[PDB]
Amino acid sequence: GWSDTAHGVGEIPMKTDLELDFSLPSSSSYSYRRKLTNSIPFHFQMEKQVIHAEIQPLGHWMDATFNIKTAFHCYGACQKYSYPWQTSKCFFEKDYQYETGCNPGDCPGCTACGVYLDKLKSVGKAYKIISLKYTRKVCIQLGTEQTCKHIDANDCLVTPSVKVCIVGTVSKLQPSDTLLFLGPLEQGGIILKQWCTTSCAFGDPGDIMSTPSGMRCPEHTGSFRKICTTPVCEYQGNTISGYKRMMATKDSFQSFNLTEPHITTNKLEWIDPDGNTRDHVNLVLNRDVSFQDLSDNPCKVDLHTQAIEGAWGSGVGFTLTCTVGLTECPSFMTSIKACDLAMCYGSTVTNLARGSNTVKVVGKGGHSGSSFKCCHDTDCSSEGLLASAPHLERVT
Amino acid sequence: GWSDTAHGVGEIPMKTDLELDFSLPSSSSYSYRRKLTNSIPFHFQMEKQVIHAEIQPLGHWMDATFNIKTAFHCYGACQKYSYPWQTSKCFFEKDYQYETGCNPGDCPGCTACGVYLDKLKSVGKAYKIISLKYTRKVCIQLGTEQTCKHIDANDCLVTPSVKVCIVGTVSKLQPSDTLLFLGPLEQGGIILKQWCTTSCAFGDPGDIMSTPSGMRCPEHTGSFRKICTTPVCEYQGNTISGYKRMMATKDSFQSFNLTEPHITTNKLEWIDPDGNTRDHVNLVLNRDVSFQDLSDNPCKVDLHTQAIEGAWGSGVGFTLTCTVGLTECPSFMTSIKACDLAMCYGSTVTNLARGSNTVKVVGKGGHSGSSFKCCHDTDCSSEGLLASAPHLERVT
Amino acid sequence: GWSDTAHGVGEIPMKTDLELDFSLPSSSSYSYRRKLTNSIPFHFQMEKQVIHAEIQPLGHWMDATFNIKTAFHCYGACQKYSYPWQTSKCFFEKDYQYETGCNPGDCPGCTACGVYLDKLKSVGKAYKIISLKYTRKVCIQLGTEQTCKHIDANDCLVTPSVKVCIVGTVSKLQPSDTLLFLGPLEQGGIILKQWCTTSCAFGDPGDIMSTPSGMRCPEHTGSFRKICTTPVCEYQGNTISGYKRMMATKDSFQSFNLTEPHITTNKLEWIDPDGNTRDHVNLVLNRDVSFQDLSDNPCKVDLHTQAIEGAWGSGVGFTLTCTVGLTECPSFMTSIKACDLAMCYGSTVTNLARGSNTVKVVGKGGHSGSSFKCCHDTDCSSEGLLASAPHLERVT
């Protein structure tokens, strides 16, 4: 039956006017100009590849000094007086109250132990990658008709007589990677496969995180001990911060650079300047009547967003229930996408029958204000649906 | 010399009857029907891509409550009486016996500390990915001759006059990834790059694991302390379970969905419903006498499984020593595979000489009952060999 | 304008003499011989793929036994006497001096605790992967003119009349992976995604590391306690070494084998014997005057290395400032590379104008003696620059 999922052409090579087959750096453009005989001008322009990363913003990674202080007062109870470290942003406290052999002179009590972090200094911003999308802008002008589109990696553009396909194993960054920028985005980031998430301890990568909703403080896994002169508190645990431990071995981690980067709340956009990342590009110009666009179809698709579940800004994603009506075709195998005002975040291939169908699409990314709509090609539903906030909370 | 490792054709494009070049979603089929002139019917059917993951079954991940109880009895010795927590599936015990200042009234002893987990609830099944294989079923009918085969990704099918090649960077899942299904497989899983393996502590991802051979209990890394009234036990360590720590930040991890999934002891089979994963498909129909199958060869290959070492169900794999006899050809460069009744798990390219050769193939996956045989194309040895059980034991 | 970044050709398929399109194992060669009519001999030889991994050498991973000893002497002070474990390569010490109820008989003192590791045995060498590069040697002989080059994956070779392109999702190993060889390289390695780097504790993968600059000892995160007869030291912490914990579950990790491997200080070179890794190969022989090499250009490029910053042997890399003069062309979009005597480590695509330009290239890898030069094609600067030593130190 009919289907538009195949993005490509059927051709007779004998009838092909021109074929291009080359490898191009991701960071390179390409321009080709030849006059086609009848003279007909012909222009093929491919732009630099653009990386689109849906990111979770993690805030500022913090450096700090580890401190422990004892406070022994002979007065009654431990809670009745408070202690100097309790003004710190992050402190962990243990109180040895009404226990014993340990009384210093003049005291016939409370022994307050306190570990806290001060000299807090931001060392860079961190982002966790939800999804990655690689696109290139391609413009084709055959005579007086121009066609421009943004082509995804491993996808093809089909015009009445030109087919342009890209194929590239471009994938240095991975989803759920953690990007750390010690400076402005322009100066590049560091990829960290290890970054604390479910069990952030002091000294872990990402231990102290200054977020917009306040500070996020690491647990101290060491053990306390009361020494018995006035008692002194002792802590057996990690003293050195996660930042200092990473910088000491910093050259162990993978960097990645960014040219002209643009950033929003949930998305990072740049061009990778590494000229070694190459994809394969194939262009075929074939003006014969037998040059068939494989995606041609007389089918019509009506879209309505039925329901939504799941979260925005999540590597788990959201699930979008679509009501897809099909007319003018007995069946039609196609792709239905989840898109908002900005762009799309996921697609599902279904086999549609005459009449109404129900189609569920899993999207990944988006923000609080994204109104995700069911989309086909450039046709989306009239209405969109907001998703739930993502669960990204330390348990502490 | 001769060689069948190249899966493809040499053609004259002028003599090509038809060429198809398109990108297709992994989750999409494709059908093409054109009448070839002489009329000759021609049908090209490509099916959805099927993901084959050799998995290590890890059992049920468990949620639990952390408990600590003290038991002080004045009677002699600590071992002589046992304690209530010792019926729990997972408990860790420390006994302060015959030590000191700490005696409560009426006692002129044993102080039993016990941390244990109860309210154990299964929260999902977990699997570690050994290997990944992406296949598509392709059927070609030129006139009255039909050819169907399952093509691996980045491989080609060659018929007397048709060449079909697939090229796809399809690889979202990675080997040694950990898949967690909070529900039935149908409802999808979560990818976890961090999952405890060599040092499972309480609070780690995968801390409490209910396996078929019984329970697998996490270590508690905290420290004990006897407080001195009857003595009270104190524990400085993580109280919150790994499950609760992950759910609190669940939206941080990558999901993956599965359509019509099928599961065995060591293998998970499904179709990825994400329509954004696209591979490149190229078909060439060329009926000219100069259309040469590059893998054509008059060579004959005899197979015998010599020995085996290594383990089934292991990402390290097993090594299969093959005795490969070659006749009717001076040399022959080919691929020798390790396959069982179900399918194949690895292949090795060698350069064979006239007579007997020894060829070692590394396979990954399989199960206890798999009888791995040396195979060439569809020809395998008569006899197979069982492999060793995999070493997948916590040290505890 | 002009550009040589596109490695490929523009052709008329009708005028094509011969086209090859096949998939080949990475571990396979290929040879094709046909006589071209006028007879003209034609030879196309493709060699096995070669993996080039820039590695950071980590030294010998060590197995050990965990020991704890108490030393109580009644004499004055703890420092005045030293203790037997202090000859061990790795020991961690805690001294309970001048504290209290605990005095054994004949003593009216010092209680020395000592945890140490002995029976140290090397269990294998470990390497962290900086970067990966996949190359194949390809030779083309059309009549009396031969052209040989080493082609990178996803790149094309262009001769006056032949175009050879490779496209392959070949990427089992990943950058910043950790390779462990329990034996000689020939016998294969194990990939470890978890390998301690910023917080190496006893029991972590890679806990005890014998490096050329001496030993690297793990921290012991447990807690000490003085028991009160002469006092006994107690340690609550992990007793079992990282090696023993991995071997107990060894079959959980991914292996990779190596044929004829060659190793230097900063680079590992081999051929992957897995015959399932396949890339796509396309050859086009087209001797028509319209067969245009897309990289043809009359431009000339002068090179001078301006400055360098960053480190050799680092997954973060070094930044190379190049002075690139352009003559004979108004503009020229090209690739400028960072290479030393051995090979290249990175490239940057720029748009050059008439006259002098400044171009910054990020390289990854190299060694202490590498003199990195700015390069274009096979033309490099006369002078090179040394980079800084990488920061790869445990904080301890």
Ligand SMILES: *[C@@H]1O[C@H](CO)[C@@H](O[C@@H]2O[C@H](CO)[C@@H](O[C@@H]3O[C@H](CO[C@H]4O[C@H](CO)[C@@H](O)[C@H](O)[C@@H]4O)[C@@H](O)[C@H](O)[C@@H]3O)[C@H](O)[C@H]2NC(C)=O)[C@H](O)[C@H]1NC(C)=O
């Ligand atoms: C591609 O990305 C790379 C990583 O994102 C970029 O590397 C960065 O390049 C900058 C610019 O040179 C370096 O900054 C330099 O730092 C050194 C040393 O300073 C360090 O030490 C002091 C003292 O402890 C400390 O206070 C600093 O904060 C630093 O930690 C200075 O001497 C220089 O003058 C300059 O400030 C970065 O260090 C470096 N990043 C890393 C991780 O090494 C690279 O430049 C990018 N290249 C391009 C072309 O975009």
Ligand SMILES: *[C@@H]1O[C@H](CO)[C@@H](O[C@@H]2O[C@H](CO)[C@@H](O[C@@H]3O[C@H](CO[C@H]4O[C@H](CO)[C@@H](O)[C@H](O)[C@@H]4O)[C@@H](O)[C@H](O)[C@@H]3O)[C@H](O)[C@H]2NC(C)=O)[C@H](O)[C@H]1NC(C)=O
């Ligand atoms: C693709 O895969 C995704 C992940 O595998 C799928 O996401 C899952 O979708 C189901 C169906 O809606 C969700 O189940 C819902 O859960 C919410 C909330 O329940 C949670 O909280 C309660 C209370 O704490 C707890 O008891 C539960 O166990 C849950 O933890 C309910 O309100 C709903 O009625 C429904 O039960 C899953 O939560 C969700 N998974 C995740 C990880 O979020 C997705 O549906 C798949 N899509 C397709 C098309 O296959």
Ligand SMILES: *[C@@H]1O[C@H](CO)[C@@H](O[C@@H]2O[C@H](CO)[C@@H](O[C@@H]3O[C@H](CO[C@H]4O[C@H](CO)[C@@H](O)[C@H](O)[C@@H]4O)[C@@H](O)[C@H](O)[C@@H]3O)[C@H](O)[C@H]2NC(C)=O)[C@H](O)[C@H]1NC(C)=O
């Ligand atoms: C591809 O790579 C694989 C991994 O690098 C290779 O697997 C290795 O193959 C060798 C050769 O057979 C095995 O060595 C064998 O070990 C067993 C058991 O010995 C173990 O136990 C003892 C006692 O505890 C201990 O002392 C040893 O050190 C071992 O830990 C012996 O019975 C055999 O005689 C032989 O020595 C390796 O064990 C195995 N590696 C792993 C991780 O299992 C594989 O051979 C490679 N194949 C090719 C074709 O290159």
